[PDB]
Amino acid sequence: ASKLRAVLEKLKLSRDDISTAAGMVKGVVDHLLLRLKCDSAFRGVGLLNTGSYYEHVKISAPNEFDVMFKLEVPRIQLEEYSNTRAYYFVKFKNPLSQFLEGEILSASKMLSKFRKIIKEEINDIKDTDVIMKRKRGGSPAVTLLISEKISVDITLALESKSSWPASTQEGLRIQNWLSAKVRKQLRLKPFYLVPKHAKEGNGFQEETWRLSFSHIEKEILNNHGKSKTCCENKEEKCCRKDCLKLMKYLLEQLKERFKDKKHLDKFSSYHVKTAFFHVCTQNPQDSQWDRKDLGLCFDNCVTYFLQCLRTEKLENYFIPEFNLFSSNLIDKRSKEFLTKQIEYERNNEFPVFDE
């Protein structure tokens, strides 16, 4: 109650920091898109603004932005990699011919050239401080740092206007919440492939791409009620986004405190975002998200997330047979360790939230 409202107040973004950040990001991004379009392989590239900033669920500071540089590949032919449900080979039924490795459009080759053109172009921005960060972790994105403060993740994304792959057939269970008619409209939209590679033993299948529905996630978060006027009037202010912000802060704070020995490195904000969409499906009515039930609604989010950890099950919201919490990705010790830390916080009314 009083305690969670105080935390939400602290996580609010300053209008002044938003104004300055948005100006700086949009200028660097609009420039790189202009420049990339001069390469014959990237002529049709377009921008999509995605992730927590554009979903209005970014917490603490506007210091991390996400953008997709999307490219329509017509006549695209997909082959699921090794029953992974989320990872695919891309084949054709000319423009990208330089990135072919046999019949296969190589994600690694396309990503290397994308990164190379961006790296060359930022070095000829003279008006503004822009560096590229080192290639770190499993991200499909190239990461920039603007004026030593603002991180920008830019992912290449192939756009397919074809029907979503079969692995999404039982995904996006929004019928009871956002309606069947909305599920149908959303599935008529394109889907994206980003250069995140399937695991292969010690290594990776450097050719493979992964499905992305970041654009659908944004549409859902910014149009998130059963009521079309959800959060447009002081009588319909739900706590859905407040719950997701508090879950993000719970995870960020535990990861910071356990930095000494880094037990929580496999966990990411996308784990709490996925878990949150599942609680939305379970609790489809706006009356299950009344501002006056914030503490209960937060508890619903914490308890589902604890069940996900204990059961080692957290389905991708779009691809049900893709388990983000399988032992292939996160070891059992790491899940039991996060379970123990979140139980403690739940049992002591979230001391990690004091200061």
Ligand X SMILES: Cc1oncc1/C(O)=C(\C#N)C(=O)Nc1ncc(S(C)(=O)=O)c(-c2cccc(F)c2)n1
Ligand Y SMILES: Nc1ncnc2c1ncn2[C@@H]1O[C@H](COP(=O)(O)OP(=O)(O)OP(=O)(O)O)[C@@H](O)[C@H]1O
- Chain residues binding ligand Y by CB under 6 A are 50-52, 58, 64, 66, 153, 212, 214, 217, 269-270, 273
Distance CA 245, CA 2 (A): 16
Which residue's entry shows tokens 């204990």? 310
Q: Which helix (H) or strand (E) holds 244?
A: helix 240-257
Distance CA 69, CA 243 (A): 30
Q: How far is the CB of 51 from Mg ion (least distance, A)?
A: 4
Distance CA 68, CA 324 (A): 22
Say whether residue 297 binds Zn ion (CB under 5 A). Answer: no
Q: Which does 138 bind (CB under 5 to 8 A by kind): ligand X, ligand Y, Mg ion, none?
A: ligand X
Which residue's entry shows tokens 């993000």? 248
Say whether residue 32 binds ligand X (CB under 6 A). Answer: no
Strand partners, 71: 158
Say whether residue 286 binds Mg ion (CB under 5 A). Answer: no
Q: Which does 231 bind (CB under 5 to 8 A by kind): Zn ion, ligand Y, ligand X, none?
A: Zn ion
Say whether residue 64 binds Mg ion (CB under 5 A). Answer: yes
Sign of CA dihedral 167, 172, 175, 181: negative
Q: How far is the CB of 161 from ligand X (least distance, A)?
A: 17
Q: How far is the CB of 228 from Zn ion (least distance, A)?
A: 11
Binding site members for GTP: 50, 153, 210-217
Q: Could you say which of 32, 211, 231, 279 contacts Zn ion (CB under 5 A)? A: 231
Q: How many of the chain's residues bind ligand X (CB under 6 A)?
A: 17
Q: How far is the CB of 212 from ligand Y (least distance, A)?
A: 6
The residues in 207-226 that bind ligand X, with binding defined as CB under 6 A, are 212, 214
Binding site members for 2',3'-cGAMP: 66, 153, 196, 210
x/- binding map, residues 126-155, to ligand X, per CB under 6 A? Answer: -----------xxxxx-----------x-x
Nearer to ligand Y, 84 or 214 (CB): 214
Q: Could you say which of 28, 130, 194, 250 contacts ligand X (CB under 6 A)? A: 194
Smallest CA-to-CA distance from 224 within 59, 107, 56 is with 56
Smallest CA-to-CA distance from 71 within 43, 90, 108, 39 is with 43
Q: What is the 3-state secondary structure (H, E, C) of 18-57?
A: HHHHHHHHHHHHHHHHHHHCCCHHHCCCEEEEECCCCCCC
Smallest CA-to-CA distance from 223 within 286, 157, 293 is with 286
**Residues in touch with Zn ion (CB under 5 A):** 225, 230-231, 238
